[PDB]
């Protein structure tokens, strides 16, 4: 099933990169009771918050992250969203390693790096989730963008597991 195993990896690699990169770009992470400029239902993403109903519907503003090292470092990380963006770059490199694996069969270690890239990408996304939730607290519900990011974590880990499985199968048949 080597053909379908690589097909699962390349399809999953694109979906993991696609699902997470939409979460960063869109502005529907949290549905909170906020204000855009009176208080109005608003939908806030990682960078901009916009009203959901009323006269000022569609008027978005940049999220102001800043209003003592313990809490300064927490909001500094959340301000630039280092972890959610970092996992996007790791997912991007992992996809390149998977695609380049088929374009160069000389070294089998390239697909191993794709598994490590995707496994590391998932870990960076959990930190982005924990940092975002923790900084948000300092009535609400999470929108599709937040669930888009969480679904990108499951896909990235499963592709990472399968990518290592291909490398293990490739090396085991050579040695045995």
């Amino acid at each position: 099933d080597r053909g379908i195993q690589m097909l699962i990896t390349t399809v999953g690699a694109f979906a993991a990169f696609s699902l997470m990169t939409i979460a960063v770009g869109t502005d529907y992470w949290l549905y909170s009771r906020g204000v855009c400029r009176e208080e109005v239902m608003t939908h806030s993403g990682l960078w901009r918050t916009c009203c959901l109903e009323g006269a000022f519907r569609g008027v978005c503003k940049k999220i102001d992250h800043f209003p003592d090292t313990a809490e300064y470092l927490l909001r500094a990380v959340r301000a630039s969203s280092v972890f959610p963006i970092l996992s996007v770059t790791l997912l991007f490199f992992g996809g390149l390693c998977v695609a380049a694996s088929e374009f160069h069969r000389s070294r089998h270690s390239v697909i191993l790096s794709a598994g490590i890239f995707f496994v590391s990408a998932g870990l960076s996304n959990i930190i982005g989730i924990i940092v975002y939730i923790s900084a948000n607290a300092g009535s609400y519900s999470y929108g599709w963008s937040f669930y888009f990011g969480a679904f990108s974590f499951i896909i990235a880990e499963i592709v990472g597991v399968v990518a290592v499985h291909i490398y293990i199968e490739k090396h085991q048949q050579l040695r045995a």
């Binding site: 496994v119 870990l123 959990i126 989730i129 969480a150 880990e157 990472g160 597991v161 290592v164 293990i168």
Partner: protein
């Protein structure tokens, strides 16, 4: 599930998947059977503190098991501690009680002897009650006793109606008798 917030439960599953994959990854391409399926079983057993038939043997594998054990120990103790706090606070009233709090709104009948009693009162508790009642919005007052009875019944225990003891006793006996007179009488008078 209340002892832990819904976000904590989501991240526990996310951490569970991450630990299982990382333990499987560092156990396979290492010198010296932790497959993907076996890693999920061992990680599940560690979180429930039930133990398994295998333990990691490499230093890289043992670090993953070591931290995952620490995460499990803090979380399980947090669930037991918060549940105990949640149960013990639940285990742990009258006019003054009604005046001190603000979660329950209390009103009277409009153009009635009770409203006049509260308006012209000089007792600290009743003066405080009147100062609250005059400003309350929406109006805590009603146009009829039936209106006050329906308001207490449909406010789901968020509305306390101040009425005469005779009507109160009569109502508390009427079906569905989902109302209750609380405390004594604020004063004494007659028709």
């Amino acid at each position: 599930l209340d002892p832990l917030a819904y976000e904590i439960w989501m991240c526990i599953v996310f951490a569970y998947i991450g630990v299982s994959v990382v333990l499987f990854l560092v156990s396979r391409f290492s010198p010296y059977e932790f497959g993907i399926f076996n890693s999920l079983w061992f990680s599940l057993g560690a979180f429930m503190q039930q133990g398994c038939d295998i333990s990691p043997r490499s230093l890289s594998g043992r670090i993953v098991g070591g931290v995952w054990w620490f995460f499990t120990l803090i979380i399980i103790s947090s669930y037991t501690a918060n549940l105990a706090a949640f149960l013990t606070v639940e285990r742990m009233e009258s006019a003054e009680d009604l005046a001190k709090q603000t979660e329950i709104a209390y009103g009277t009948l409009e153009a009635g002897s009770t409203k006049e009693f509260f308006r012209r009162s000089k007792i600290a508790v009743f003066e405080k009650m009147w100062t609250y009642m005059k400003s309350a919005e929406p109006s805590v007052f009603v146009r009829t006793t039936e209106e006050g009875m329906i308001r207490v019944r449909k406010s789901k225990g968020k509305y306390a109606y101040l009425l005469e003891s005779t009507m109160n006793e009569y109502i508390e006996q009427r079906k569905p008798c989902d109302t209750m007179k609380v405390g004594g009488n604020l004063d004494s008078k007659g028709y």
